[PDB]
Design a protein around this nucleic acid. Structure first.
Lengths: 213, 22, 99, 88, 132, 82
RNA sequence: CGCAAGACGGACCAGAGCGAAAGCAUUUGCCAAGAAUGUUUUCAUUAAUCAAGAACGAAAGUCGGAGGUUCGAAGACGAUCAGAUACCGUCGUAGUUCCGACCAUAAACGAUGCCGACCGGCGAUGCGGCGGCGUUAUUCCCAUGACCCGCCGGGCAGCUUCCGGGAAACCAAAGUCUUUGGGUUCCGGGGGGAGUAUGGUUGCAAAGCUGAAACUUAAAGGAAUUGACGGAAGGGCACCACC
RNA sequence: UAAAGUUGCUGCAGUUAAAAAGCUCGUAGUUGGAUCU
C-alpha cells in the first residue's frame, strides 16, 4: 500500500471480508503467523487482522505485477475450494493455472510433457499445495500463499493472512488478488467497482449446483 | 562358548587350583 | 543397534518396575513391558444368549459380563497373534487398532 | 439361627456387591478410594463395613484422567469412616 | 477373468473421446462404428473394444467419468463454472460480528458501520476435544 | 522471528516473563495499606507476607500466609502502592 | 461353615510420581528428611569437579537365631526322543520370609559423567505459583475444593532435523568441531592370549579390587544395502500339491 | 623419526565400532560471577 490514500482499504472491501468470514481463522496458530492475527475469541478462534491481510494482498499484487510476462505467474489449487477461483484468476489476469493434482516433477523434470518454468508461484494453501511449494525450492521460484492461522510458512515468501478453508473466503481472496493485480497493471480503474462480482470465484459443490438449478 | 559359561569354567579351574595350592 | 526408543517398555524416570506373570507361560515380565489386554466379555456366549434368556426366571435380566485383565510376555503375545511384527516405520504407530 | 415349625429363621449375616458390578466400577483413568471401620451396633453386633468410592470426571472435563491428590484421598477416606461410624 | 487390458481400455477411451457423436448404446451399432472409424487388426479385439465402449457409454450416460473428456460434458461443466447469482452472497444487509472483531474494526478505523450486529459471545470456553 | 527487538520489548511481553528473566528484573510483589473496621492507623502489609498479620485495634487477623500471595480476610480494603 | 499359618499387596497402576543409585504401592499414627514453587527475608563467594578416604548398594551367596505358606537350585521319579540325568509333568532340599553380621557384584543401561551458557516449533502431563469468562458443592452475604482457558518456574516424557551433527542407525543433543580452547573427574588405543598368570590387598567362604607377559593373528568389529534362508507373520496360487 | 589427528598441548576418542566408575559425598589437585579512572 505504501500508506497512500489511493491504495487504502475501503468500506466495501471490509464488508466483503466480513461477509466471507475472511477474518476468522482456526483454533491453532503457527508461530510465524502470530504477527498477522489480532486476538483469540472465547471459542478459541483467532481473528486475522484485516489491515495486515490488505497489506499482504497488495504486496502480492505488486510481486505479480512485477512479473513482465503474465503467463510466467503460476496459480495452484489442489483443493476444489480454490480450483474454480484459480481458473477465474488465470482467465482474468493471464497466469497459468494448475487446478487439481500437481504432478511431481512439473518444475524439475525438463524431459516431461507438462514441464513449466514459472517466474512466480501462487497457491491457495501451503499445507495442501506442499508439493509445488517444495518444488519451488529447486528452481529459484518465489512463492505467494494464502495462509490461515495454522499454515506452515516454509518456502512461503508472501503469506496473505486469510481464512483459506471456507469457499467464500477463498473465492473472495483470489478475486481481490485479481482485481488488485489488474488495477496495478492499468486495465480497469479503481474509481468505480469492478464489473466481475466475487461469486464468480466461489466453489459450488454438487449439492449446491443441483439445488440452485 | 557363551561368555557366562566360559567365566564359570575359569572360576572352577581357579577353585581347583587354589584347592591344590596350600 | 537400538530397535526401539523406549526399549520395548514404558519406563521413564524410574529405576525398577514390579514384575508380573504372563497369563500363558507364567513368565516374569515387568508390568510396564508386559502387553495388557482388558477383556470385557459376556458370561453367556452370543450363540447361547437366546436359550439362556428364554429359560430365565426373571424377565429383562441383562446377563452379567466377564472382566479379565490379561498379561502377556512378548513371546506369548506374538505367538497368540495379539501383536504382530511391524515395519520400521509402522512400529512407531502407538494408536490402538480401530477394530 | 433357629428352626421351629420346619421354617428356618434367618438373620442378617453380611452384605456384598456382585463381582461384575465391582469389576465394572473399576475403570482406568480415575482414583478409587476404599475405607473400612469396625463399628458395633447398639445390640452388641460388631460389623466391618467396607466403603468404595470412585473419582468422577466433570461433564466439561477435557483432561483424560481425574485423580484425587493424596491429601484429598485421605480426607475422603476420613469422611467415609466418620459417616459409616455415625450411621452404625 | 474378464478384465480388459490397457489396449482395449485405452482404445475405447480414445474412440469415445474422438467419435462420441456416432457411438450409441447398442453393441451391434458400436461394433460397426468401431470397425469403421478405427483400424483394429483383430476381430476379437474389435469386439472387446466395442463391448467396453458400450459399457463406458452406459457409464457416461449416468454422469461424468474421469478418463474421457467429451466436448459436450466439458461445455456443460464450463457453463456451470460461469454461473453468477443475481445478488452477491456477500451483499448481506446484516453481518453478525463478535465483539472482538468489532474492536478490531474500531482499531481498523471502521467503527461507524451500521451493517454489523454485535452478537453475544459464547460464555463457554469448551472448544477442544476431550483427550483420550 | 529472526528480528525480534530485545532493547524495547512490549510491556505485556515483559510482565509475561519470569521476574528474573526480564530485561531488568523486578518483583511481582507489592505492599498494600489495609484498612480494618476495628482501627484507624496505617497497616502496610506485604502481598506475599509469610507471617500472620494482626490488627492492633481488634482481635481480627489481617492476612494469612499462603504458598503465594497472602490471603486477605473478607471485609478489609487494601490499596496497592508502586 | 469356621480355624491357623506364613507369603503377597491384584484390579485402580499411567512412557504418571518420589529417591543419589539400588529401589519404592493396603489403612492409620509417630519420627526425622526432601525437591520444586513463593519471597522487595538473611549471609555475602561461602562455589564446580574431584587423587586419598567414606556412606549406600538388586539378586544370588555365607555365618548365627526365628520362621518355614507358596515357589523351588540340588535331588527322586514319570514322560513323545536315536540318546536327558534338558525342555514338559508330580514331588522335593538348600533357598525364597524376618532379625543380626558379612558379601560389594548385575545388560547396577539412557550400553550416553557432572556443573554452566546458547540454539526451533507444538500439544500434553506432574508439582507449586499467578490471572481470567463461565459450570458445579456445604444454610441466601465469600474464599476454597472439582472442572474450564491461559501465563511463569522446576520435572518425567512425546519431536522433524535441510537449526546442526553423525559411518549411519539415529540424537534438540549424541548440536554450538580442521570456523578445532567454558570448568573438571573417570577412561579407550586392531583381534586373541585374558580380566588369565603372578604379586599385593579385602573376605569365614564363595569370591572382590588392582592386574601382565611369552605367544598368536589380518583382520575382528560397527551401521546400513541387496539377495538367500527362517520349524517368522500377512495375502494369494498349483491335481509335476493336498483335500 | 615423519607418515601417527593410531598418544591428540596444538589435536583423537568413550550410545551401538575399544571405552563414563552402580551411586553419592568428599581432602589434596584443577577451575572459579560483576565491580576501583
Amino acid at each position: 500500500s505504501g500508506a497512500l490514500d489511493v491504495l487504502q482499504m475501503k468500506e466495501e472491501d471490509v464488508l466483503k471480508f466480513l461477509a466471507a468470514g475472511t477474518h476468522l481463522g482456526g483454533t491453532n496458530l503457527d508461530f510465524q503467523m502470530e504477527q498477522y492475527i489480532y486476538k483469540r475469541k472465547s471459542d478459541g478462534i483467532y481473528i486475522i487482522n484485516l489491515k495486515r491481510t490488505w497489506e499482504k494482498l497488495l504486496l502480492a499484487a505488486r510481486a505479480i505485477v512485477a512479473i513482465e510476462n503474465p503467463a510466467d505467474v503460476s496459480v495452484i489449487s489442489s483443493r476444489n475450494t480454490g480450483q474454480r477461483a484459480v481458473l477465474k484468476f488465470a482467465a482474468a489476469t493471464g497466469a497459468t493455472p494448475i487446478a487439481g493434482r500437481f504432478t511431481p516433477g512439473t518444475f524439475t523434470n525438463q524431459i516431461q510433457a507438462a514441464f513449466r518454468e514459472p517466474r512466480l508461484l501462487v497457491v491457495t494453501d501451503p499445507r495442501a499445495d506442499h508439493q509445488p511449494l517444495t518444488e519451488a525450492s529447486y528452481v529459484n521460484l518465489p512463492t505467494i500463499a494464502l495462509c490461515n492461522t495454522d499454515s506452515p510458512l516454509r518456502y512461503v515468501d508472501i503469506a496473505i493472512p486469510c481464512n483459506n478453508k471456507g469457499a467464500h473466503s477463498v473465492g473472495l481472496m483470489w478475486w481481490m488478488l485479481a482485481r488488485e493485480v489488474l488495477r496495478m497493471r492499468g486495465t480497469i480503474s479503481r474509481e468505480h467497482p469492478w464489473e466481475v462480482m466475487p461469486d464468480l470465484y466461489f466453489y459450488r459443490d454438487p449439492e449446491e449446483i443441483e439445488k440452485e438449478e | 562358548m557363551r561368555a557366562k559359561w566360559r567365566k564359570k569354567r575359569m572360576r572352577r579351574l581357579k577353585r581347583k587350583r587354589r584347592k591344590m595350592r596350600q | 543397534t537400538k530397535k526401539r526408543r523406549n526399549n520395548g517398555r514404558a519406563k521413564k524416570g524410574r529405576g525398577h518396575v514390579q514384575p508380573i506373570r504372563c497369563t500363558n507361560c507364567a513368565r516374569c515380565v515387568p508390568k510396564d513391558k508386559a502387553i495388557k489386554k482388558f477383556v470385557i466379555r459376556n458370561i453367556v456366549e452370543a450363540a447361547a444368549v437366546r436359550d439362556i434368556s428364554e429359560a430365565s426366571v426373571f424377565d429383562a435380566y441383562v446377563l452379567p459380563k466377564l472382566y479379565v485383565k490379561l498379561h502377556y510376555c512378548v513371546s506369548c503375545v506374538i505367538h497368540s497373534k495379539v501383536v504382530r511384527n511391524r515395519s520400521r516405520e509402522a512400529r512407531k504407530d502407538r494408536t490402538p487398532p480401530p477394530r | 439361627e433357629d428352626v421351629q415349625g420346619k421354617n428356618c429363621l434367618t438373620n442378617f449375616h453380611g452384605m456384598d456387591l456382585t463381582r461384575d458390578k465391582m469389576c465394572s466400577m473399576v475403570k482406568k483413568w480415575q482414583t478409587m478410594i476404599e475405607a473400612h471401620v469396625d463399628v458395633k451396633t447398639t445390640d452388641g453386633y460388631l460389623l466391618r463395613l467396607f466403603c468404595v468410592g470412585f473419582t468422577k470426571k466433570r461433564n466439561n472435563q477435557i483432561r483424560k484422567t481425574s485423580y484425587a491428590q493424596h491429601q484429598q484421598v485421605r480426607q475422603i477416606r476420613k469422611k467415609m469412616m466418620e459417616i459409616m461410624t455415625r450411621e452404625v | 477373468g474378464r478384465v480388459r487390458t490397457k489396449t482395449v481400455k485405452k482404445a475405447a477411451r480414445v474412440i469415445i473421446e474422438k467419435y462420441y457423436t456416432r457411438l450409441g448404446n447398442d453393441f451391434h451399432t458400436n461394433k460397426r462404428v468401431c470397425e469403421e472409424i478405427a483400424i483394429i487388426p483383430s476381430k476379437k479385439l474389435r469386439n472387446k473394444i466395442a463391448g467396453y465402449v458400450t459399457h463406458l457409454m452406459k457409464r457416461i450416460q449416468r454422469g461424468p467419468v474421469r478418463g474421457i473428456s467429451i466436448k459436450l460434458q466439458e461445455e456443460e461443466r464450463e457453463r456451470r463454472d460461469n454461473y453468477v447469482p443475481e445478488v452477491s452472497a456477500l451483499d448481506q444487509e446484516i453481518i453478525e460480528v463478535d465483539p472482538d472483531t468489532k474492536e478490531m474494526l474500531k482499531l481498523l478505523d471502521f467503527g461507524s458501520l451500521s451493517n454489523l450486529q454485535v452478537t453475544q459471545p459464547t460464555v463457554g470456553m469448551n472448544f477442544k476435544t476431550p483427550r483420550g | 522471528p529472526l528480528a525480534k527487538d530485545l532493547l524495547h520489548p512490549s510491556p505485556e511481553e515483559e510482565k509475561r516473563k519470569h521476574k528474573k528473566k526480564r530485561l531488568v528484573q523486578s518483583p511481582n510483589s507489592y505492599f498494600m495499606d489495609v484498612k480494618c473496621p476495628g482501627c484507624y492507623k496505617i497497616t502496610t502489609v506485604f502481598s506475599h507476607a509469610q507471617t500472620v498479620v494482626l490488627c492492633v485495634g481488634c482481635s481480627t487477623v489481617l492476612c494469612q500466609p499462603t504458598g503465594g500471595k497472602a490471603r486477605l480476610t473478607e471485609g478489609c480494603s487494601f490499596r496497592r502502592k508502586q
